[PDB]
Amino acid sequence: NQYDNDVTVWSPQGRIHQIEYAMEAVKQGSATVGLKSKTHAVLVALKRAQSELAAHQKKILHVDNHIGISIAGLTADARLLCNFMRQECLDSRFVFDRPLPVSRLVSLIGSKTQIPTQRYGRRPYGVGLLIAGYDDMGPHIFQTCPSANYFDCRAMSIGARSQSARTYLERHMSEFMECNLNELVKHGLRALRETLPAEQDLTTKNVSIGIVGKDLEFTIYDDDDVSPFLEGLEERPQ
């Protein structure tokens, strides 16, 4: 095909297949889970292992005490956007000394990721992100795509095998809004279990959680926090 040069090439079909390949690179990532209540925002991650003598790749990165992120893609661009959001949060704390609202930051990332999509010389940032953030205007759970677009989701899941999760969150969204933090994290864990293969099960080693709240700063909930929340998980019947 002639039409697979840089994103500058418009397809006759009205597409730019580089962008679609970027979405596929998003689907190249592992399963992720993101869900909020009316008072908290929680994202749940599945840390992919490498071997019995190596550690799992981390999926949840800290940007600010009020905004958290979860990645799915080529980790290079993921970390580059992570540093970007860290810098913008710092400038927001510097100028007027105010925690940056989620929406404006996400719009800035959208513009930044869009500039490559028009301009030759740089591939668009090809990583899928889940964003958890709370501000003085509202609680937010967000996702973004390398197409330089972002979507505010009550409940969201990206990666391989994610459709079973997506069905779980679509069925249960009649429940979360006023669920407590423990119930919300249990819902997230149940959503993760849906994507699991029949031969693999959740444990502290491969599960990562991230929670932010109006009265709870964003922190990354790894093995230590995974240990108590594992109880109450839905079983695996047939």
Partner 1 sequence: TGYDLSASTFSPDGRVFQVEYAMKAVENSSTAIGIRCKDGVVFGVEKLVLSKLYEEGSNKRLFNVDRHVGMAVAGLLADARSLADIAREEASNFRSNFGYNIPLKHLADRVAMYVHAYTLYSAVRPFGCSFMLGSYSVNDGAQLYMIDPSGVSYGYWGCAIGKARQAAKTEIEKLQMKEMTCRDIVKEVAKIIYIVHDEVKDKAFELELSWVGELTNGRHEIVPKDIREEAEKYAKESLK
Partner 2 sequence: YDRGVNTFSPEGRLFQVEYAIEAIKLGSTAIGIQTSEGVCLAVEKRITSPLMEPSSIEKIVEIDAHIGCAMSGLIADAKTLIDKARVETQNHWFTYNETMTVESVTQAVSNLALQFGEEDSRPFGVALLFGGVDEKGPQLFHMDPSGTFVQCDARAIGSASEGAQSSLQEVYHKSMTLKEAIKSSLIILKQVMEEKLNATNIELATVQPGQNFHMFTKEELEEVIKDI
Partner 3 sequence: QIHSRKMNVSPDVNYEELARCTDDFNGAQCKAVCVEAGMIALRRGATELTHEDYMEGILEVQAKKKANLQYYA
Residues lying near partner 3 in the complex (CB under 8 A) are found at: 28-30, 48, 50, 57, 74-75, 160, 163-164, 167, 198, 238
- Return the one option of partner 1, partner 2, partner 3, none that residue 188 interacts with (CB less than 5 to 8 A, by type): none
Point out which residues bind partner 1 (CB under 8 A).
2-3, 5, 7-12, 14-16, 107, 110-111, 113-115, 117-121, 147-157, 166, 169-170, 173
- Return the one option of partner 3, partner 2, partner 1, none that residue 119 interacts with (CB less than 5 to 8 A, by type): partner 1
Phi and psi angles of residue 211, each rounded to the nearest 5 degrees, phi first: -125, 140
Whole-angstrom distance, CA of residue 158 vs CA of residue 28: 10
The two three-digit tokens of residue 156, written as one number: 């969201």
The two three-digit tokens of residue 82, written as one number: 């992570």
Phi and psi angles of residue 171, each rounded to the nearest 5 degrees, phi first: -75, -35
Give me the 77-116 binding string for partner 2, x by CB under 8 A, dash otherwise.
x-xx------------------------------------
8 Å CB contact between 58 and 83: no
51 binds partner 2 (CB under 8 A): yes
Looking at the DSSP bridge assignments, the partners of residue 116 are: none
Among 38, 98, 104, 122, which residue sits at the site for partner 2 (rule: CB under 8 A)? 122
**One-letter amino acid for residue 157 of the chain:** S
160 binds partner 2 (CB under 8 A): no
8 Å CB contact between 129 and 69: yes
